[PDB]
Design a protein around this ligand. Structure first.
Ligand SMILES: Cc1cccn2c(=O)c3cc4c(=O)n(Cc5cccnc5)cnc4nc3nc12
Length: 538
């Protein structure tokens, strides 16, 4: 005498608590945060009594009920928790309940709770390591790498990292605020489009297609609410719940807005937009501030002020206070980090001994010491120590670490930078004693993607055979290759120089190692980062 068993009607099964508008280019229209997903289910009864009550069950728990008044019905209700649910329709009367077969529905949320884990095999030369050293092992993944570089989130050797940094999250602003972007074709216009209707000095997403909509492994179904980099990072967090995924704000071309944050009106708006961003995108674990640089001498020759050091310290303090409030609301731990210049000249513009009290980690950019931006003075771009031919070299890793320690920075805060790329010159000439670095160049070396820069993958693949000389400088702890016929000279990190940096980190009780940029490694560099810090293989 119980009701007939209903049949769930064919229809959409994927819903979203944070909805992405699929026909919008402005961040304010693209992202719609709701308190709950609007879910809809219909059913038909092809045999029997329709009962007197109809219920929608999610994993057995009623989400909706109403009178059963005909052979077909529809239910609209709200679901406030993300996940994949076994949904049933049940028809009930005084003599019993009859539940349909289950249909899986998706209620998407930005922690990835609706997503299958993105657990992918290691590629190229990457070998498995356990994160049991207690040291930082970090790397940058770049938003634009999914195009020409064809390097997507499913290719990250995520088990071999403690920290994954996402470069880069922009700060809204047009003329005079993001002028450095005008040097990249279409890039300034892209940010203005993303920021339409949005206040200057709030964060946004620079390339929303790459971030949210490009089909990628695990998020290829047209009705998947989140695709692109963010969708995959949510699924990666499901596979690696202890991985720290941090949005990096700034970098070389997106740092101009920081120079205006001495105005607390702008600084407050920025910090508040970061809080909203983390509440919106729950898979991120904090924020990384990559201001290049307090005091100027970044991409924009017209920016930089003596107040920048005070602004930096105030910004870190206020970001920390915001993250502590967010941590209290969610129960989660959030991290505040910053990538900083390793040059003593720039380090002494900031009181890092004060700012460290707000920060979890300082990512010391101990690379780019030399490069094709200077054709007259050549040197190791990421070396640990000075070379034998110039022991007074200003830009070395040790000089940057020592400058921080001299201010009073605790060694455990300091994460040493390694390069997964080389910088190089062409036409090097006029050098002495077989040391090409004592000469001068006529231009940049032919690069993988841009002049003067070469992926480590390509260095190991193409430039360690043939006419290329190879030398490991054991005084500086730095490899380099040189082709004398053309004068091509590339300075980079290899497994052995990374080994020296890791041993140095352990010896000086520093925080760990990090790298730029993950797509450029073939595995050798990250392998050595893990091994040198004492992570066990496996
Ligand atoms: C190709 C491209 C397209 C669009 C935007 N792009 C950027 O915004 C970039 C920024 C940086 C940058 O900031 N650095 C310094 C650095 C090192 C370590 C940590 N943080 C910062 C180095 N290379 C970069 N390449 C960039 N390329 C692009």
């Amino acid at each position: 005498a119980a009701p007939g068993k209903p049949t769930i009607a064919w229809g959409n099964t994927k819903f979203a608590i944070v909805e992405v508008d699929q026909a919008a280019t402005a961040y304010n229209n693209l992202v719609k945060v709701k308190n709950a997903a609007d879910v809809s289910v219909s059913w038909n009864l092809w045999n029997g009594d329709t009962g007197t009550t109809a219920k929608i069950l999610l994993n057995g728990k009623e989400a909706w009920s109403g009178p059963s008044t005909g052979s077909s019905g529809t239910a609209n209700f709200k679901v406030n928790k993300g996940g994949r649910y076994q949904m049933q329709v049940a028809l009930c009367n005084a003599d019993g309940c009859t539940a349909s077969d289950a249909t899986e529905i998706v209620v998407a949320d930005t922690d990835g709770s609706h997503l299958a884990p993105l657990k992918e095999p290691l590629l190229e030369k990457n070998k498995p390591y356990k994160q049991n050293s207690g040291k930082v092992v970090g790397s940058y993944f770049v938003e634009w790498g999914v195009y020409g570089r064809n390097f997507t989130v499913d290719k990250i050797p995520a088990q071999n990292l403690t920290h994954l940094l996402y470069g880069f999250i922009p700060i809204c602003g047009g003329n005079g605020i993001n002028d450095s972007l005008k040097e990249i074709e279409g890039s300034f216009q892209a940010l203005q489009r993303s920021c339409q209707g949005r206040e200057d000095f709030k964060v946004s997403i620079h390339d929303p297609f790459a971030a949210l909509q490009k089909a990628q492994k695990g998020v290829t179904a047209w009705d998947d609410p989140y695709k692109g980099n963010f969708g995959q990072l949510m699924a990666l967090k499901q596979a690696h719940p202890d991985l720290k995924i941090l949005p990096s704000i700034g970098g070389w071309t997106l740092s101009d807005p920081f120079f205006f944050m001495g105005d607390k009106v702008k600084r407050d708006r920025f910090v508040g937009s970061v809080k909203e961003f983390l509440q919106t995108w729950k898979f991120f674990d904090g924020v990384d501030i990559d201001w290049e640089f307090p005091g100027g001498k970044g991409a924009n020759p017209n920016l930089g002020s003596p107040q920048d050091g005070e602004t930096y310290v105030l910004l870190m303090k206020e970001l920390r206070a915001m993250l502590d409030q967010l941590s209290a609301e969610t129960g989660r731990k959030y991290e505040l980090t910053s990538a900083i210049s390793a040059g003593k000249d720039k380090i002494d513009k900031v009181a890092y001994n004060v700012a460290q009290n707000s920060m979890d980690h300082i990512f010391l950019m101990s690379y780019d010491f030399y490069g094709a931006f200077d054709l007259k003075n050549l040197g190791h771009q990421t070396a640990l120590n000075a070379p034998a031919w110039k022991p007074d070299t200003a830009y070395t890793t040790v000089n940057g670490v020592n400058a921080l320690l001299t201010q009073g920075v605790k060694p455990g805060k300091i994460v040493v930078g390694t390069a997964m790329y080389g910088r190089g010159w062409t036409g090097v000439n006029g050098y002495q004693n077989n040391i090409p670095f004592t000469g001068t160049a006529t231009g940049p070396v032919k690069g993988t993607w841009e002049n003067g820069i070469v992926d480590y993958r390509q260095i190991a693949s193409q430039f360690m055979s043939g006419e290329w000389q190879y030398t490991y400088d054991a005084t500086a702890e730095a490899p380099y290759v040189f082709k004398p016929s053309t004068g091509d000279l590339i300075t980079f990190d290899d497994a052995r120089s990374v080994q020296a940096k890791g041993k140095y980190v352990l010896d000086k009780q520093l925080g760990g190692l990090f790298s730029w940029e993950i797509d450029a490694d073939n595995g050798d560099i990250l392998n050595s980062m893990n091994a040198s810090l004492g992570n066990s293989a496996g």
